[PDB]
Subunit: 222 residues, 3 copies
């Protein structure tokens, strides 16, 4: 279509789709109750992303927000995606270390605050206020990274896989606020097709690569 | 009012209302923790449906979507309903067989994908794309029916009630994609008043009849 | 700004903000798994409220609804807030008395029905129907108060704290339907700046004061 970023959305659609099917087939036969939690999470995440990538590709998950006296194309469907996939990803890490329920509730809650404020900043028509929402969202992310790092006699397999998955998370999630900031939702320093490209690379690595690393460890089994 | 289907919405409103009160009174006195889960679910489902049937009757849960160069009346409130009641119904079956948590998460996740994609197809302005969303939703339903059928030393009361409730589910839920397809959200082969009528009969049977069958078995008690 | 109620929104924003940070710092060091559930809840609630109070202050959580041949300013962001904070508050009480899961599901479900119908009444363009939604919401609240009162060998610390927190709840929550009824969402007998003021006093007491009382008892620890 006439949207330069269409190619990255089609590509993202394809990659999330293939990853979903891949995890689906791989989870076939799993009977371990613990492993079943990781397969479910690991398959559900790209499955949701696929649908949200498809609605962006078809034009449904897109809206125009006026600001800076311009009509800016905002892909709201990413928040619909993140709203469910990021807490699911956080659950995988938490089941991993057998996190206390209070901690999980804190993470999920901070995460929803994180995505919900980013969405409000994304749709805000007063330019300066967009960055206020961006800051609160960022504060929520730092909270989460903090607990991932400092809130966590576990099996050496568990820790070993956790450290890896936790380093992956901190590095890939921290990039999202930067893309947003430099991208069309914020300062507009990077054009929307490049921004969509960056998010597509982060999403697939945060979702497919994360699940491949996760589904490789024996830490997921009881 | 001037909407021929008003009668089925009023009737559905009434039936969900009466069923709610019926289950409410019947659940009075229940102290068994397990039974309390089924009563809660069984009462909550028609309670939600009542509210969504009432907003359709009053005109709130209705919106016009343009497609095929026409202005089509779409009852979005059904998805608001289904979004919560279908996973609750799936929970009753899963508690029944004492399903593993990983399986429940898979079912709820597929279910949300199922209703969320159907809603997007319902609101999509490009005619052909409506059917793409319809197909993905259908694929999610088949997944669910698959696990209900093939993902499931349980008490003979449990199995016995499960088989019945599971046959009911497969038969009534499979009809929804067909109604949508033939109805005003899809090919428009069946007029909206007939479609609302069909959904009302499915909803009450899927909700009230399902709960009557459920609340009759001793399988729900510990 | 040009909205007389801005001062109460700024003030509410400030108070929820300060309470969040206060609970955050106080929860530092907590290792008891049970206590962690109460701190998380107690911090998450004002944290969400802060964000919703800020979007009201900035004008984002506000919309005009026509009715009575007038264009009425409706703060929809309060429902976005309540939708998550009221079930969380109900969870604190339920963990307190160690409520059965079936009961919790009933409370959360009734609560969502309560806030969701109030939101629909809030956005309804037919004046008389607003009060129908108001009534169903009120019926859902009475249900909840009923179970809090009559659905509940617990530690004397637990009961003692529960009675207090339960008396607080019944008294503050029962005021919300009255404010709405007399306020701009209903009969319009009280102007919007006074209504916002009343809700701000209820919100801070229902959220910050409730959490201070809660976080004072040894009932929250194992
Ligand atoms: C918990 C724990 C944490 C609580 C989070 C705190 C912050 C909550 C803020 C949220 C409020 C939502 C704002 C938004 C829905 C308001 C919609 O109005 C839009 C902007 O005025 C209209 O623009 C055009 C419309 C655009 C549409 C975007 C909608 C998006 C939907 C994503 C959610 C989905 C719901 C699952 C449905 C299936
Ligand atoms: C931000 C703190 C961390 C926490 C405080 C929370 C939010 C505070 C506001 C952040 C920064 C507001 C918002 C100010 C943007 C400012 C450039 C607006 C300038 O107005 C110009 C015309 O009046 C708009 O041109 C438009 C030209 C655009 C290309 C300019 C883009 C603005 C940029 C915003 C920068 C914010 C970050 C650098 C925050 C990183 C710290
Ligand atoms: C950090 C500390 C909080 C920042 C305090 C600032 C106070 C702003 O004062 C008024 C300007 O005189 C802002 O209202 C004038 C109009 C504008 C309103 C913006 C004020 C609010 C955004 C203040 C809420 C704090 C923000 C949260 C930024 C993220 C935080 C978690 C670090
Ligand atoms: C975008 C890429 C970085 C650029 C090119 C990628 C090549 C270099 C990758 C950098 C990453 C490396 C992280 C490795 C980690 C290994 C540490 O393992 C430790 C074992 O105990 C974990 O403890 C403690 C571990 C500590 C690890 C902290 C990770 C750092 C956090 C960075 C967050 C992100 C970077 C900010 C985003 C940027 C785009 C603004
Ligand atoms: C999980 C696990 C699975 C994740 C699901 C994957 C698919 C998610 C898709 C969802 C995205 C929502 C789309 C929709 C909200 C966008 C709203 O915009 C409408 C169509 O442009 C506006 O039309 C007119 C507006 C119409 C209004 C319809 C809204 C409906 C609301 C139903 C949800 C409710 C939320 C509970 C509130 C109380
Ligand atoms: C569908 C597969 C299972 C999986 C693939 C996912 C979606 C693929 C598209 C499905 C079918 C698109 C969509 C094509 C509809 C086609 C009739 C549109 C014709 O265009 C006409 C004018 O150009 C519109 O008249 C309007 C006249 C209407 C009365 C015609 C209604 C269209 C019907 C759609 C039929 C789809 C199903 C039969 C799928 C069952 C398999
Ligand atoms: C809409 C009605 C069907 C039409 C009139 C209703 C009268 C006939 C009802 C058909 C139904 C009968 C199902 C009975 C079942 C009994 C099987 O019990 C078995 C015991 O182990 C369960 O194992 C395995 C059980 C297997 C059962 C599979 C059920 C079939 C699935 C049908 C799904 C729906 C039909 C598709 C919808 C249609 C409207 C396009
Ligand atoms: C369960 C258990 C219980 C089930 C509850 C039963 C009752 C459910 C009713 C709900 C339906 C939602 C209605 C509403 C979203 C429809 C939106 O359309 C508005 C009014 O036509 C548009 O006005 C202008 C738009 C305004 C925007 C208001 C949206 C609000 C959003 C609050 C929810 C948030 C979602 C978390 C996002 C982060
Ligand atoms: C309500 C029962 C408990 C349960 C039934 C569920 C809803 C039933 C409807 C409630 C009451 C409808 C709605 C009737 C409002 C009525 C005054 C409308 C009058 O119409 C006037 C012009 O025609 C509008 O002037 C506008 C002037 C306004 C200032 C008038 C405000 C109306 C008030 C509504 C009063 C409802 C409560 C007192 C319910 C408490 C019991
Ligand atoms: C209490 C009992 C239920 C009230 C019964 C009333 C029936 C209304 O009859 C029609 C007027 O002849 C209403 O439709 C005419 C147009 C109007 C439609 C309103 C009818 C519905 C609102 C009836 C649904 C009951 C309401 C729920 C009020 C709260 C309830 C939980 C106490
Ligand atoms: C808004 C304020 C009331 C006005 C000024 C405040 C000063 C007086 C506060 C009233 C409150 C007092 C409640 C104390 C309680 C103490 C009872 O403890 C008992 C120990 O077993 C609990 O069992 C059973 C306890 C029973 C307690 C029932 C509480 C009452 C319920 C009132 C709900 C609210 C009032 C309706 C709102 C109004 C604004 C229309
Ligand atoms: C069987 C396994 C290994 C995987 C097959 C699933 C296929 C789907 C795509 C998986 C891609 C992700 C690899 C890990 C993370 C990233 C660094 C990839 C970023 C995305 C961009 C291009 C990647 C190349 C290709 C996989 C086409
Ligand atoms: C005490 C029990 C048995 C039930 C009383 C609750 C009353 C409310 C309506 C219950 C209806 C559902 C019966 C099971 C399923 C269906 C096949 C019914 C489809 C709906 C259409 C008309 C049904 C007739 C009537 C119940 C008015
Ligand atoms: C360390 C403790 C005690 C608390 C400090 C947190 C500060 C934030 C505000 C807390 C206010 C709530 C007190 C309990 C409930 C209410 C009756 C208060 C209603 C709100 C209106 C004004 C209150 C005064 C002030 C706290 C500024
Ligand atoms: C599958 C996708 C993932 C893992 C998404 C992570 C997205 C983030 C961590 C988002 C963070 C944001 C903020 C911290 C600042 C405001 C903007 C956001 C929403 C991009
Ligand atoms: C209480 C109502 C119930 C039990 C609803 C079930 C509804 C379905 C199983 C819906 C399925 C759909 C698809 C499979 C295709 C697309 C359209 C839908 C949303 C009707
Ligand atoms: C943190 C805020 C809290 C504790 C909110 C409680 C709000 C209520 C109990 C709301 C009730 C309502 C009804 C009973 C009637 C209709 C209007 C509402 C939504 C205000």
């Amino acid at each position: 279509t006439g949207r330069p970023e269409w190619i990255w959305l089609a590509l993202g659609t394809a990659l999330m789709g293939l990853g979903t099917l891949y995890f689906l087939v791989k989870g076939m036969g799993v009977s371990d109750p613990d492993a079943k939690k990781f397969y479910a999470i690991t398959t559900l995440v790209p499955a949701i992303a696929f649908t949200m990538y498809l609605s962006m590709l078809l034009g449904y998950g897109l809206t125009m927000v006026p600001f800076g006296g311009e009509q800016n194309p905002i892909y709201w469907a990413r928040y619909a995606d993140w709203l469910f996939t990021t807490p699911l990803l956080l659950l995988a890490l938490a089941l991993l270390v057998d996190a206390d329920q209070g901690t999980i509730l804190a993470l999920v809650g901070a995460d929803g605050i994180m995505i919900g404020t980013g969405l409000v900043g994304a749709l805000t028509k007063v330019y300066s206020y967009r960055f206020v929402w961006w800051a609160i969202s960022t504060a929520a992310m730092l909270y989460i990274l903090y607990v991932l790092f400092f809130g966590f006699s576990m099996r050496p397999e568990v820790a070993s896989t956790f450290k890896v998955l936790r380093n992956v998370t901190v590095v890939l999630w921290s990039a999202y606020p930067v893309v947003w900031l430099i991208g069309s939702e914020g300062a507009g320093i990077v054009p929307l097709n490049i921004e969509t490209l960056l998010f597509m690379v982060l999403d697939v690595s945060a979702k497919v690569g994360f699940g491949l690393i996760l589904l490789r460890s024996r830490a997921i089994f009881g």
